[PDB]
Amino acid sequence: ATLKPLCPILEQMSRLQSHSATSIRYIDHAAVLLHGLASLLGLVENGVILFVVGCRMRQTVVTTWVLHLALSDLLASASLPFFTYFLAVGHSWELGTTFCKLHSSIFFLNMFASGFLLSAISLDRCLQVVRPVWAQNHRTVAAAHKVCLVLWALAVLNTVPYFVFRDTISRLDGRIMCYYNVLLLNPGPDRDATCNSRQAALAVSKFLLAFLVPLAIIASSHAAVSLRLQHRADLGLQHRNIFEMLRIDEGGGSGGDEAEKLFNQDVDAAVRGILRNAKLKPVYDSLDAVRRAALINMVFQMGETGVAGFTNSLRMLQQKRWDEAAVNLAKSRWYNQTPNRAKRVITTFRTGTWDAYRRRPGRFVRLVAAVVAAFALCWGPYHVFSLLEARAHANPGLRPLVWRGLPFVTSLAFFNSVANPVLYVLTCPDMLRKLRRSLRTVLESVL
């Protein structure tokens, strides 16, 4: 027999029951089937989405975001069946204490990930429009994959406190609760103070890092590209800027600090390095303006020492043998790893015609706007109530109000993992089209 000190919120919660002192648990079977089907749908929907985007669809930077975005929701749908079991038993956790920490961590892991990814998506789209020269040279899929790995690492780092402060608390009804045990580790001299501060520190930091700050970034980046496209379209209407390429002064200001701007686009800096190298100077001067700019992109992507490694490729550009140079370039490590930023360069050497990067409209815009809309509507009410239960430590009157909505708005955030794969299809015709392809392919395994 062991006794653990609890918060006044949990202590008041460990005696809540309809019938006075009994072990008979009332069961809401309507919610069991609801979350049961939600568990089934979530696993199947995100299951096929991962397959479609990840195997049948051509891999891009944007699809990589969506891929991980649907990966986090897959895990959220993997812990959900254990929440169904929780309801089926009668709101009691009967699967140990460590598993309680894991199951809970998946919820917050999904939360932070979905908040960090949606931030990454907005920032990526921001760099695509605001920083065209940098984006066309460094926005490779390999980079986008490494970003996600950092985001997951930061996500699991912010779910550790939740993993730690999760515990099994016995009710008087025989029920076993799985919730916040703030006082589980290092209780201060003032229990009521360390109970309030830690709960507030959790609810607030969660609200910021996984909701307010993302929505701030999303709304702020959305305004950046809107003004940029307006100023860009104004430049496009000008007759003199018909054949111009690699602009930087779209953001206004001056070119005095181009070598210091994050996400660098300093074209002049690259040119000075080209004229300095013995293997690049005679090749640069022999090229026309369109092909000279394509050479600047190569030293942007792999440096000047990297482009000087292609001896009998510069030998080809110097002799204006474009096609035979194209063959040699497309058979390298540089093209094999990052084909999209490479092919755009090679074709320029081939045709001598500039293909504008800031000309290409953004993709999955309908998708992200929908996913963002759902994210704000499903995690919205949650953070509201969760901030109120941290507020309810001081105000006991809010405690009954919390448990009239918190179980609802929490399951509302759970259903965000079910909504997204549907939203993927409804806003992305290619994704839906690619799905009905494989759907028809498998169904044709009867003939």
Ligand X SMILES: Cc1c(CC(=O)O)c2cccnc2n1Cc1ccc(S(C)(=O)=O)cc1C(F)(F)F
Ligand Y SMILES: CCCCCCCC/C=C\CCCCCCCC(=O)O
- Look at residues 239, 214, 149, 174 and name the one whose alpha carbon lies nearest to residue 25: 174
**47 touching ligand Y, by CB under 6 A:** yes
Give dist(CA 153, CA 309) in Å, integer: 36
Q: Is 45 marked active-site? A: no
Within residues 279-318, the interface with ligand Y by CB under 6 A covers none
Q: Which of 127, 178, 299, 419 binds ligand X (CB under 6 A)?
A: 178
Choose the stretch contacting ligand Y; rule: CB under 6 A; options: 50-58, 180-188, 290-298, 402-410: 50-58
One character per residue 54-93, x = contact with ligand Y (rule: CB under 6 A): xx--------------------------------------
**104 touching ligand X, by CB under 6 A:** yes
**149 touching ligand Y, by CB under 6 A:** no
Give dist(CA 131, CA 300) in Å, integer: 14
- Look at residues 5, 11, 13 and name the one whose alpha carbon lies nearest to residue 189: 5
Give dist(CA 423, CA 411) in Å, integer: 18
* Segments in 52-170 forming alpha helices (H): 61-89, 98-130, 132-138, 141-157, 160-164
In the set 45, 94, 244, 250, the catalytic residue is 250
- Look at residues 383, 382, 374 and name the one whose alpha carbon lies nearest to residue 409: 382
**407 touching ligand Y, by CB under 6 A:** no
Helix (H, G, I), strand (E, B) or coil at 178: strand
Helix (H, G, I), strand (E, B) or coil at 170: strand
Rounded least distance, CB 151 to ligand Y, Å: 13
Choose the stretch contacting ligand Y; rule: CB under 6 A; options: 7-15, 42-50, 96-104, 292-300: 42-50
Q: Which of 52, 109, 177, 298 binds ligand X (CB under 6 A)?
A: 177
> How is residue 351 written in tokens?
């045709």
Beta carbon nearer to ligand X, 36 or 132: 36
Beta carbon nearer to ligand Y, 47 or 407: 47
**386 touching ligand X, by CB under 6 A:** yes
Q: Which of 17, 340, 347, 410 binds ligand X (CB under 6 A)?
A: 410
Specify burial of residue 349 (Cβ count, 10 A radius: 0-12, 13-18, 19+).
buried
Give dist(CA 311, CA 316) in Å, integer: 9
Give dist(CA 214, CA 220) in Å, integer: 10
Q: Which of the listed partners (ligand X, ligand Y, none) does 386 bind, with a CB threshold of 5 to 8 Å by partner kind?
A: ligand X
**50 touching ligand Y, by CB under 6 A:** yes
**63 touching ligand X, by CB under 6 A:** no
3-state secondary structure string across 21-50: CCCCCCCCHHHHHHHHHHHHHHHHHHHHHH
**388 touching ligand X, by CB under 6 A:** no
First to last CA, the chain: 65
Beta carbon nearer to ligand X, 21 or 446: 21
Q: Which residue sits closest to ligand Y, CB atoms considered?
A: 47
**107 touching ligand X, by CB under 6 A:** yes
Rounded least distance, CB 44 to ligand Y, Å: 5
Beta carbon nearer to ligand X, 16 or 142: 16
What residue ranges bind ligand X (CB under 6 A)?
13, 91, 104, 107, 177-179, 386, 406-407, 410
**Which residues have a catalytic role annotated?**
250
